[PDB]
Design a protein around this nucleic acid. Structure first.
Length: 538
DNA sequence: ACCAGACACACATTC
DNA sequence: GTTGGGATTG
DNA sequence: GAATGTGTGTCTCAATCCCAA
């Protein structure tokens, strides 16, 4: 706010950061850009950044009025000289529609339209075949008096951004939102040589998978698209999971479009969690039962998760039935406590969960609604110094909500000493007070576990009295077995009876919902450790 | 935290 | 004359 | 009719402004 050229300073900051830490990852023509950019006049740098930050790559001169930069047609000149911006670009009929207003376009294509008022997209559809070729604005309308500037250095800028944040989903608005105190991140003191990418060849791989996904959302035929993907897996951990997550989605699309034979073959090329299970169910829907049974038996011998185990638990008997085999006695597990209500006639538009909490209200009993919120936050506070540890590779810029290696399978190990030191506080008295200090110190900070908006002061200290430390262990341990797989699945409500220092937690279900798989996995968990849980059926 | 997951809801399918 | 979606704002 | 499987709608800072309706 206090500096009119704040956006340019942020852009300069990224450029300098790139120059320091990612110098070897940068190529010849890219080094030339950063050098050339600094030699530009201040108002020319500013105008360029504006176009880079804004949605399009095409801009009307009228839509480029900025008081701090002054005359735009003048400031754009050093950019036209470098060829970074292009007046007189050639425009498809589809993108000319994006630049002009509806009334302007109706005037132009007057001798090709009826008297009927159509929507803008309708006009585009009618006129698209009559003008399939692209052409200069002067060739569209010679009477046009506004110059339209095309930004021609957008790809280089994306790479710059992709190197700064370890991704492309974050953009330059992080700087503003952080400065305005709308986003407050934990400040991890990381090395001067902490890296997003370590080598340029991996950056190109990221961009490729990005565009593969891009063309996929653009309805481009998978047959061609698949030939774009690499045969052998990527050597890099992040990149392999992405290549494999992409393969997983192609098979999802194939399966939904009733092509189970391709979907199967694709699911098996993927190591994405749940792919192998989808491969079996696809083989089943393709009525290739013998093959589906062979893979299912292979899976059940060495399952990838407890999630796959319960998926196989339904798949296998059904598969054995379609073959000649007899089904084996699938005797169930112990049953969590049940609690029933009368589908109580709702007062106004409202939800089932909120009503149950109102009903379970009682003098000695307070009830809250905190699905996943409560336990993830309590775990987030106790292991704050562990999660935001200055592990090399974890952090490499500001604007970090979580360490980048959060989903890695050795996330716990790299901080194994720190975690035992935090959960070690859960044995002596320190944990209760340790949480209360984090809460006051770290409040508001962006984090992957703590729900500040929901963890009110009362809910906090009510939990600290009732919830047993030995219980808090078992939960925190299960999260560390598999964070992405055990982040969710916790029951709707917790209810404390603070005076008698006991808790009981409930997941409610209306007439239009049943227990999810993961929710079932946790009720089974708490049951086996004598933890007060129950399912409320309404 | 690296391109959504999470959940509740709702309507097919299959012995 | 009003309303809603989206982009450009900080 | 149970047990299942699959398929939807919703939600990522908030006041401003241009444009399509």
């Amino acid at each position: 706010l206090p500096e009119p050229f704040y956006y340019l300073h942020n852009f300069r900051a990224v450029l300098a950061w790139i120059g320091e830490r990612y110098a070897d990852l940068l190529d010849d023509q890219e080094r030339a850009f950063i050098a050339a950019f600094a030699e530009l006049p201040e108002a020319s740098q500013a105008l360029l950044v504006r176009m880079v930050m804004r949605k399009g790559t095409l801009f009307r001169e009228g839509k480029l009025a900025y008081a701090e930069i002054g005359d735009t047609r003048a400031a754009v000149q050093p950019l036209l000289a470098l060829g970074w911006v292009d007046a007189q670009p050639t425009l498809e009929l589809a993108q000319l529609f994006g630049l002009l207003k509806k009334d302007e376009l109706s005037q132009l294509f007057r001798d090709h339209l009826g008297r009927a008022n159509l929507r803008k997209d309708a006009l585009l559809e009618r006129l698209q075949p009559l003008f399939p070729e692209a052409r200069r604005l002067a060739e569209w309308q010679a009477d046009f008096a506004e110059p339209v500037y095309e930004l021609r250095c957008m790809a280089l800028c994306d790479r710059l951004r992709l190197m700064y944040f370890g991704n492309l989903w974050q953009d330059w608005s992080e700087f503003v939102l952080a400065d305005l105190g709308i986003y407050r991140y934990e400040s991890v003191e990381f090395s001067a040589d902490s890296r997003g990418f370590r080598l340029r060849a991996d950056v190109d791989a990221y961009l490729h998978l990005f565009d593969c996904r891009q063309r996929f959302d653009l309805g481009e035929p998978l047959e061609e698209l698949l030939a774009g993907l690499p045969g052998e897996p990527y050597a890099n951990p992040w990149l392999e999971g992405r290549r494999v997550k992409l393969l997983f989605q192609f098979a999802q699309h194939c399966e939904k479009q009733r092509d189970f034979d391709l979907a199967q073959r694709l699911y098996r090329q993927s190591s994405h969690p749940g792919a192998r299970l989808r491969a079996i169910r696809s083989l089943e829907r393709g009525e290739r039962f013998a093959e589906a049974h062979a893979l299912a038996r292979e899976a059940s011998c060495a399952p990838e998760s407890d999630a796959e185990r319960q998926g196989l638990a339904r798949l296998l008997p059904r598969l054995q039935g379609k073959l000649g085999l007899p089904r084996q006695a699938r005797a169930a597990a112990p049953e969590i406590d049940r609690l029933d209500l009368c589908l109580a006639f709702p007062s106004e538009p409202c939800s089932v969960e909120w009503a149950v909490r109102e009903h379970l209200e009682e003098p000695g009993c307070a009830v809250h609604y905190v699905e996943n919120g409560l336990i993830n936050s309590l775990f987030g506070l106790l292991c704050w110094e562990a999660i935001f540890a200055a592990i090399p590779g974890a952090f490499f810029h500001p604007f970090h909500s979580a360490p980048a290696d959060l989903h890695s399978a050795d996330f716990r190990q790299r901080r194994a000493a720190l975690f035992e030191a935090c959960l070690g506080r859960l044995e002596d008295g320190s944990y209760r007070d340790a949480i209360r200090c984090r809460y006051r110190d770290k409040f508001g900070l962006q984090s992957p576990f703590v729900y500040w908006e929901l963890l009110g002061e009362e809910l906090l200290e009510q939990a600290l009295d009732c919830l047993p430390a030995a219980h808090l262990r078992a939960w925190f341990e299960r999260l560390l077995e598999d964070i992405p797989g055990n982040r969710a699945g916790l029951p709707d409500l917790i209810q404390f009876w603070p005076a008698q220092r006991r808790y009981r937690m409930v997941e409610v279900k209306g007439p239009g919902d049943r227990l999810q798989d993961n929710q079932l996995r946790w009720l089974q968990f708490c049951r086996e450790r004598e933890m007060p849980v129950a399912v409320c059926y309404v």
